[PDB]
Design a protein around this ligand. Structure first.
Ligand SMILES: Nc1nc2c(ncn2[C@@H]2O[C@H](COP(=O)(O)OP(=O)(O)O)[C@@H](O)[C@H]2O)c(=O)[nH]1
Ligand SMILES: [Mg+2]
Lengths: 105, 405, 205, 37, 292, 117
């Protein structure tokens, strides 16, 4: 729910050096931008808390982003799968409702 | 075949008068046929541990298939709204093909009810709702009649939703005991079945299928890994099109089977056998000496029964060569017709234990094949060498015997 | 290269090279040893930004095969230092403006190897302790390097990747039919989707 | 399929007293993961 | 020692709300999320350390109610000790409720006529305060006339709701009709009251916090038992927040609340305020093995 | 002994992600669905058995004191077999199991319950 530039992400990561964080910690940038540390990784283990150094590959995933869907309407959309379902029937009955339920959750 | 539906009805959970049959087609079929909605009412509308599952039970002589669905939201009265599209079949059938269709119908109507309350507002009763914050019968009629007549439906229920059900037969999974020494046949013409949607490997396997190419030979010819060839051959077996066979040699121990009387009891087997085993012209192979106009059906029947368990094909051909020369019979086609009709079989050869210097990998796979008691065919395929060289290599490695089973 | 040449679809995977079939620019979003079976729903629900850091860099032979060379020399005038803006602020603003287009800050082993074959490369930017920064940025169009000292003379060298025989001229024109939501007939699109591209910006101005 | 395979997973001894149905004895206490696979 | 209790009513009568609040430890606000009970929901609940309560939370909807008296009549209504019929005062079909109760009484008289019928007029908080007692008496006269027709000379009723403490009193008096050795408990409690010289000693249960017996059986509140039960339930739910369990409570060195055993909680109100705490605690600990 | 290993053990009160009370509930049918086959399928789990229910009288079949109390109080006992056959061999596996094991076992159990509890 806030627009960060790429340089804004770089500056926020630069401010997050030599400082230890933990899971679900609400960081703040410019007293309005809200963060959430949902995952700290080290040697293949999801540690509860970790230390952020100079060579830490910090990523900025977006929980409110613009999305583009490109559905192919082809001759195969009305074809039947081996179980007995059309592919567009799958698209409108199991992909979109599940992804909207997941997005709401 | 597909079993016809006996009775379709739509149950619903009324928050005051309980579970009941809201709509049913044909009308009053359950009461006329003896089915009572007071014995299995706890399975049609169950507690929410059995919900969202394909409940199927037996009631007398009728097998009942249903997919109960329960939606949890504060909008509905009592925080729940349960319904069930129940399908009833006679017990003495197979309800396997209709099960994914019933599950998908229940799932689709659950999705629509969660989206825009298509099934709850159709009751036209505010008792289903909290009250503080399309015809089902025609749809059931169309579903029942279209699944009884056409096994398909494109039934519209709204401006953007349609009940699209197609019923497919259930096919057995293919074998897993397919190896590199088995030649695949093709009972169907695979040239006209190829379309744009095929696997790239299965496109390449099709030209090299003629009843005499081994699976490793197909893999090497089409530049394919043997594993994907195995999977593609399994897929072709899955549709009942390709049947495996044996590599044809002149050192085989072909013997009559228990179906050799089918060459007399089948009116259309010997007639095709006359035309099948004959060369198109007077071929020169029917003119070579032993050492230096179509065939009679009785001759073919006498030649089929002349094989025995221990007489190799070389000995049988050099013991019966005037008959296969005057009648102009192709011996490979002669054997292949008998193998295809399952009237003769092959006694496999087993090198059980008791030359150029081959490589370390060759001797390693030779030892691994010997330890697993593999046939001479598999050893010959893996070493890419004939039977005599394999026998000489084994005799150099140790004493052994051949079992013709 | 944007693809790997598979000899045949019928041959199987050689060892485990499928995990190596990853985009170079987005390679840093995955962890070091966590399997990819977990990051399936996360790509759908919570899409990831393009990372600031890039762990790949061309070798010595690639700079001597298809590349060119330019030079910059920027230093803020006496008008801007009336405000609280020194050469460090200008360097920060320049790295800020190098981003927002697709650039990625280079740090790792290959960048150090190229720097030695010519001292310390930087990822972030701290103005208190350090007083001379050197850090590389790379996109497929061009590769930048920015160096600074106490003199305030910022040196920028850009290695533009030369186009290969005008790929945007070898493609036929393709004008589809686009029907929007408020329309009722399939009208004609006003832009060619194939011939529109992210142009190389004039970074000097 | 001529291969013999009696696909069995367990047995129950469910009795119905006047105080409600109850389970008296089921022999295999293993979970679904070991039994199905 | 298995006791079969039957909990019947009409749809939405609040039977599962009673079962949840009294036994399953749910708050009054948490009964709104409860779903509709399909058929009969059995609940095996252990009271004290020897009694077990087989409470049968019946459906109460029209199909379930018609199924109970036709096909399951030989299963639901045999070996039954206590019937708890729940009546809703918001219902507009009161005559149908009385007819259903008459059918239930007829079946119980036919099969197990030694039972004890209790009726609870639930949801008596939507009605105004002036007409609660009058409505309860008006419905209780008809229910007693109906009850006396199908055997069963006695029928005890309680105005109940989940937004007050009358539910605890009603369920306590329902449960206490099944507790064995009540006379021995009364005699031992009277002996302890005489020994400790206490004004009134009340004995509870540790889990459900229902009244079991009292020493007496300055004018005091006649509804003090249910209020103490509600206060102790609220205090237990408050002490669950501190990641521990309630053990003892002393008020003004005059009101002693202590865990008498692993299944009972004593409520002792003494007469003299000058008794030290240790003597009362020691006398409580001496009687801990006596009531076992 | 493989059923009691640490990696292959579940609680006694839970049977295949279901509680014991719920399984005892839905495997105990009414009178109309008793004394016959009980081929119940949930999801790739065919709960199969032959329930034996007492008649209108106390007769199980027609031609310590807690033990006698339970003998006079029990009205139905069920031997439920859990099967997971493939979808192509359901009508074979369930039919052969019920034909060769379940029917004879439940009939012998009903007979021995009828004579001497
Ligand atoms: N206002 C009020 N609502 C009650 C009371 N008792 C029960 N309810 C309501 O009853 C609903 C739950 O009913 P439930 O126990 O499932 O009815 P049952 O299935 O017939 O036993 C809840 O939403 C409560 O709001 C009461 O004393 N006062
Ligand atoms: Mg209920």
């Amino acid at each position: 729910d806030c627009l960060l530039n790429r340089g804004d992400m770089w500056v926020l990561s630069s401010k997050l050096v030599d400082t230890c964080v933990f899971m679900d910690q609400r960081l703040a940038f410019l007293d309005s931008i809200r963060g959430t540390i949902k995952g700290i990784y080290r040697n293949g283990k999801k540690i509860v808390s970790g230390y952020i150094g100079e060579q830490t590959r910090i990523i900025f995933r977006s929980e409110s982003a613009r999305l583009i869907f490109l559905i192919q309407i082809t001759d195969e959309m009305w074809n039947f799968e081996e179980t007995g379902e059309q592919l567009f029937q799958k698209m409108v009955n199991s992909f979109f409702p599940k992804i909207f339920k997941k997005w709401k959750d | 075949g597909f079993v016809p539906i006996h009775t379709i009805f739509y149950s619903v959970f009324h928050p005051t008068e309980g579970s009941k049959i809201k709509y049913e087609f044909p009308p009053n079929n359950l009461k006329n046929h003896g089915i009572n909605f007071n014995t299995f009412k706890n399975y049609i509308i169950p507690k929410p541990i059995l919900c969202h599952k394909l409940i199927t039970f037996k009631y007398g002589t009728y097998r009942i298939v249903c997919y109960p669905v329960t939606i949890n939201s504060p909008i509905y009265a009592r925080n729940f709204f349960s319904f069930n599209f129940v399908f009833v079949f006679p017990y003495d059938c197979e309800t396997s093909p209709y099960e994914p269709a019933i599950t998908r119908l229940g799932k689709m109507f659950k999705v629509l009810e969660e989206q825009n309350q298509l099934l709850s507002k159709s009751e036209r009763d505010p008792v289903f709702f909290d009250l503080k914050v399309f015809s089902i019968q025609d749809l059931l009629m169309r579903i029942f009649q279209d699944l009884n007549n056409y096994s398909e439906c494109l039934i519209p229920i709204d401006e953007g939703n349609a009940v699209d059900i197609k019923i497919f037969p259930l096919l057995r999974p293919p074998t897993t005991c397919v190896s590199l020494e088995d030649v695949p046949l093709s009972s169907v013409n695979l040239k006209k079945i190829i379309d744009v949607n095929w696997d790239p490997t299965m496109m390449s396997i099709v030209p090299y299928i003629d009843g005499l190419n081994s699976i490793a030979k197909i893999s090497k010819l089409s530049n394919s890994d043997p594993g994907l060839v195995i999977e593609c051959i399994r897929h072709l077996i899955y549709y009942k099109c390709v049947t495996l066979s044996d590599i044809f040699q002149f050192s085989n121990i072909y013997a009559p089977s228990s179906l050799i009387r089918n060459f007399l009891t089948d009116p259309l087997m010997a007639s095709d056998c006359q035309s099948y085993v004959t060369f198109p012209e007077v071929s020169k192979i029917s003119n070579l000496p032993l050492n230096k106009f179509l065939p009679t059906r009785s001759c073919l029947f006498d030649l089929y029964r002349s094989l025995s368990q221990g007489q190799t094909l070389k000995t049988w051909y050099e013991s019966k060569y005037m008959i296969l020369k005057e009648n102009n019979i192709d011996i490979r086609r002669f054997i292949t017709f008998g193998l295809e009709k399952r009237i003769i079989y092959r006694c496999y050869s087993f090198p059980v234990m008791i030359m150029p210097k081959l490589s370390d990998e060759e001797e390693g796979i030779l030892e691994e094949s010997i330890r697993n008691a593999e046939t001479f065919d598999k050893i010959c395929v893996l070493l890419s060498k004939p039977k005599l060289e394999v026998e000489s290599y084994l005799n150099e490695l140790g004493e052994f015997k051949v079992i013709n089973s | 290269e944007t693809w790997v040449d598979i000899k045949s679809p019928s041959i199987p995977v050689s060892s485990e090279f499928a995990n190596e079939l990853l985009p170079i620019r987005w390679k840093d979003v995955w962890p070091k040893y966590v399997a990819r079976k977990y990051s399936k729903w996360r790509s759908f629900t919570t899409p990831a930004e393009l990372p600031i850091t890039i762990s790949d860099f061309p070798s010595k032979d690639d700079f001597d095969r298809n590349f060119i060379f330019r030079n910059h020399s920027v230093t803020l005038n006496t008008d801007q230092e009336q405000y609280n803006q020194t050469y460090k602020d200008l360097l920060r603003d320049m790295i800020y403006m190098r981003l927002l287009t697709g650039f990625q800050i280079c740090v790792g082993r290959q960048v150090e190897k190229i720097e030695l074959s010519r001292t310390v490369v930087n990822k972030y930017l701290d103005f208190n302790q350090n007083d001379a920064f050197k850090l590389y940025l790379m996109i497929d169009s061009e590769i930048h390097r920015i160096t600074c000292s106490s003199s305030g003379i910022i040196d920028v060298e850009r290695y533009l990747r030369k186009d290969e025989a005008n790929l945007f001229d070898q493609v036929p024109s393709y004008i589809p039919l686009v029907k929007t939501r408020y329309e009722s007939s399939f009208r004609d699109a006003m832009i060619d989707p194939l011939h529109v591209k992210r142009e190389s910006l004039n970074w000097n101005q | 399929e001529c291969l013999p395979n009696s696909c069995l997973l367990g047995v129950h001894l469910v009795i119905s007293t006047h105080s409600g149905p109850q389970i008296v004895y089921h022999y295999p206490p293993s979970n679904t993961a070991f039994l199905t696979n | 020692n298995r006791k079969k209790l039957l909990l019947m009513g009409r749809s939405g009568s609040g039977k599962s709300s009673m079962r949840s609040i009294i036994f399953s430890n749910y708050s009054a606000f948490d009964t709104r999320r409860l779903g509709a009970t399909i058929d009969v929901e059995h609940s095996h609940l252990r009271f004290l350390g020897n009694m077990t309560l087989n409470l049968w939370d019946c459906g109460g909807q029209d199909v379930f109610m018609e199924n109970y008296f036709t096909k399951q009549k030989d299963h639901i209504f045999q070996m039954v000790q206590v019937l708890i019929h729940v009546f809703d005062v918001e219902s507009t079909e009161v005559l149908k409720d009385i007819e259903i109760f008459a059918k239930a009484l007829k079946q119980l008289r036919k099969y197990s006529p030694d039972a004890k019928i209790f009726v609870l007029l639930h949801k008596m908080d939507l009605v105004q305060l002036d007409k609660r007692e009058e409505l309860f008496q008006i419905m209780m006269k008809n229910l007693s006339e109906t009850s006396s027709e199908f055997g069963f000379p006695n029928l005890i009723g309680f105005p109940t709701s989940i937004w007050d403490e009358s539910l605890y009193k009603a369920w306590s008096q329902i449960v206490c009709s099944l507790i064995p050795n009540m006379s021995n408990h009364q005699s031992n409690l009277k002996k302890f009251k005489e020994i400790m010289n206490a004004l009134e000693i009340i004995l509870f249960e540790r889990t459900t916090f229902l009244v079991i017996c009292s020493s007496n059986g300055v004018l005091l509140d006649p509804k003090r038992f249910e209020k103490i039960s509600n206060i102790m339930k609220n205090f237990k739910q408050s002490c669950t927040k501190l990641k521990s369990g309630f053990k003892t409570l002393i008020l003004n060195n005059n009101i002693y609340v202590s865990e008498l055993s692993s299944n009972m909680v004593c409520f002792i109100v003494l007469k003299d305020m000058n008794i030290p705490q240790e003597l009362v605690l020691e006398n409580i600990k001496k009687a801990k093995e006596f009531f076992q | 002994e493989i059923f009691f290993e640490e990696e292959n053990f579940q609680d006694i009160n839970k049977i295949l992600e279901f509680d014991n009370d719920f399984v005892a509930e839905f495997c105990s049918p009414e009178r109309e669905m008793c004394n016959t086959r009980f081929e119940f399928t949930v999801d790739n789990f065919c709960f199969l058995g032959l329930p034996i229910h007492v008649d209108s009288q106390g007769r199980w079949r027609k031609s310590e004191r807690e033990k006698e109390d339970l003998g006079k109080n029990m009205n139905m006992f069920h031997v439920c077999f859990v099967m997971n056959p493939h979808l192509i061999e359901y009508n074979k596996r369930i039919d052969d199991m019920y034909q060769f094991v379940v029917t004879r076992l439940s009939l012998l159990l009903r007979y021995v319950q009828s004579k001497t509890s």
